[PDB]
Design a protein around this nucleic acid. Structure first.
Length: 53
DNA sequence: GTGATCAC
DNA sequence: GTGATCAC
């Protein structure tokens, strides 16, 4: 089932509400792996500090 | 330079 | 084998 959506900036520079595929703690910083739906390309982006890991 | 992850 | 993600 999907992860909680999160507002990210895409590598194109638009804000999108996207569902990460995978999330983890990068040391203290929470990181998600996202796919830009329009372009199909993967990118990583910081998650909120309270985001469920 | 570290810490984890995986599409490339 | 590693770029790229952040705050420290």
């Amino acid at each position: 089932s999907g992860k909680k959506p999160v507002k990210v900036k895409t590598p194109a520079g638009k804000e999108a509400e996207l569902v990460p595929e995978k999330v983890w703690a990068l040391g203290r910083v929470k990181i998600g792996l996202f796919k830009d739906p329009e372009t199909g390309k993967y990118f990583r982006h910081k998650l909120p500090d309270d985001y469920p890991i």
